[PDB]
């Protein structure tokens, strides 16, 4: 089997991408944030604290003839950014772009943090990291991809995120028309439960490539590109007037600037992030200071190849017995 679904930016800055997902019988369609940095499929629901719902579409398990309470199961997730959610668990039928999994754990939120409440366009998250990170207790549950994997034509999914435009998540096949040149594959460590890999280096604009190992995670659920402070300083030093602002929370730059590109290495291959992808617009309405799309990972504890990086590539998440990651230009 295969599935193919369009993913759409939630706003004019590509702050996140939402993908329609059918849950239950009859289908209830919710727009979920596909997150390769976590392993829980959770949704706003009829059980979510009323004051914590602000415009989201909710899953109502009582209206699904295929929903079953997973007796005694609870979940609770604390994301590294300080966001969180928790609740109980149903199993139900879940379909993405024509690919159907029966008995999928659907984690119904009773509580969500303010960040989620404020994101009216995101009805929940669909985790695509390794199932070892799933938070359901006392019986850990499998991700949608893990449940689908054996049935798929090939045990893979691909992320093709658009810049200021829709893109595509495919399951079970590689669309050879969706990228240019070749796909370069690189090793993955699953030791921390993430799609963790090692970039071979970077360049800023037309500058020379610096060969250096950068270990990080491919995370479709993170907006920005978080890299070591040395790398990030080297990038922003090429932008007149750019500076790190403790008050804003990262590097900002004059909105009048033209940003240089940023290149990252994948083996001997190179992915170029155009400068425009690194512009996140005014820090507040009407400001001439703009927020940067490349930020320091210092204090996160891991480097994160978020959407700013991933949207410059066609990315293969290969879930074979020994997982790997593939990157192509597009």
Ligand X SMILES: Cc1cc(C)c(/C=N/NC(=O)[C@@H](N)Cc2c[nH]c3ccccc23)c(C)c1
In the annotation, is 35 catalytic? yes
Q: Give the CB-nearest residue to ligand X.
A: 80
Strand 41-43, strand 99-112: pairing = parallel
Residues within window 173-232 making contact with ligand X, judged by CB under 6 A:
219, 221-223
Do you know the residue count of the chain?
Answer: 330
Residues within window 54-83 making contact with ligand X, judged by CB under 6 A:
79-81, 83
Is 241 among the residues that bind ligand X (CB under 6 A)?
no
Q: Which one of the listed residues 39, 45, 86, 199 is annotated catalytic?
A: 199
* Cα–Cα distance, 132 to 213 (Å, whole number): 26
Is 249 among the residues that bind ligand X (CB under 6 A)?
yes
In the complex, the smallest distance separating the C-beta of residue 41 from ligand X, rounded to whole angstroms, is 13
Is 234 among the residues that bind ligand X (CB under 6 A)?
no
Radius of gyration (C-alpha) of the chain in whole angstroms = 20
Q: Within 13 Å and on the Cβ side, how many CA atoms surround 4?
A: 9
* Cα–Cα distance, 85 to 76 (Å, whole number): 6
In the annotation, is 95 catalytic? no
Buried b (16+ CB within 10 A) or exposed e, 170-206: bbbbbeeeebeeebbbbebeeeebbbbbbbbbbbbee
Strand 314-318, strand 156-160: pairing = antiparallel
The residue (of 33 and 107) whose beta carbon lies closer to ligand X is 33
Binding mask 91-130 for ligand X (x = CB under 6 A): ------------------------x---x--x--------
Q: Annotated catalytic sites, by residue?
A: 35, 199
Q: What residues line the site for ligand X (CB under 6 A)?
A: 13, 15-16, 33, 35, 37-38, 79-81, 83, 115, 119, 122, 219, 221-223, 248-250, 280-281, 283-284, 291, 300
């Amino acid at each position: 089997s295969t599935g193919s679904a369009t993913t759409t930016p939630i706003d004019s800055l590509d702050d996140a991408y939402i993908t329609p997902v059918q849950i239950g019988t009859p289908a209830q369609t919710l727009n979920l944030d596909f997150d390769t940095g976590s392993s829980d499929l959770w949704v706003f629901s009829s059980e979510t604290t009323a004051s914590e719902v602000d415009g989201q579409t909710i899953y109502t398990p009582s209206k699904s003839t295929t929903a079953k309470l997973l007796s005694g199961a609870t979940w609770s997730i604390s994301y590294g950014d300080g966001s969180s959610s928790s609740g109980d668990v149903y199993t139900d039928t879940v379909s993405v772009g024509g690919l159907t999994v029966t008995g999928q754990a659907v984690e119904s939120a009773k509580k969500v943090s303010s960040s989620f409440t404020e994101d009216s366009t995101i009805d929940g998250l669909l985790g695509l990291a390794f199932s070892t990170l799933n938070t359901v207790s006392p019986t850990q549950q499998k991700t949608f991809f893990d449940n689908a994997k054996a049935s798929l034509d090939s045990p893979v999914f691909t992320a093709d995120l658009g810049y200021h435009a829709p893109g595509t998540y495919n399951f079970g096949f590689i669309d050879t028309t969706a990228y240019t040149g070749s796909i370069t594959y690189t090793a993955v460590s699953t030791k921390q439960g993430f799609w963790e890999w090692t970039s071979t280096g970077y360049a800023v604009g037309s500058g020379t490539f610096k060969s250096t190992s950068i270990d990080g995670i491919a995370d479709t659920g993170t907006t920005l590109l978080y890299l070591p402070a040395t790398v990030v300083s080297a990038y922003w030093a090429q932008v007149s007037g750019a500076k790190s602002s403790s008050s804003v929370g990262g590097y900002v730059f004059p909105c009048s600037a033209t940003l240089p590109s940023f290149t990252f290495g994948v083996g001997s291959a190179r992915i170029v992030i155009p400068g425009d992808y690194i512009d996140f617009g005014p820090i507040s309405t009407g400001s001439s200071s703009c927020f940067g799309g490349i930020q320091s990972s210092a204090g996160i504890g891991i480097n994160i190849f978020g959407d700013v990086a991933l949207k410059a590539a066609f990315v293969v998440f290969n879930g074979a017995t020994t997982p790997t990651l593939g990157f192509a230009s597009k």
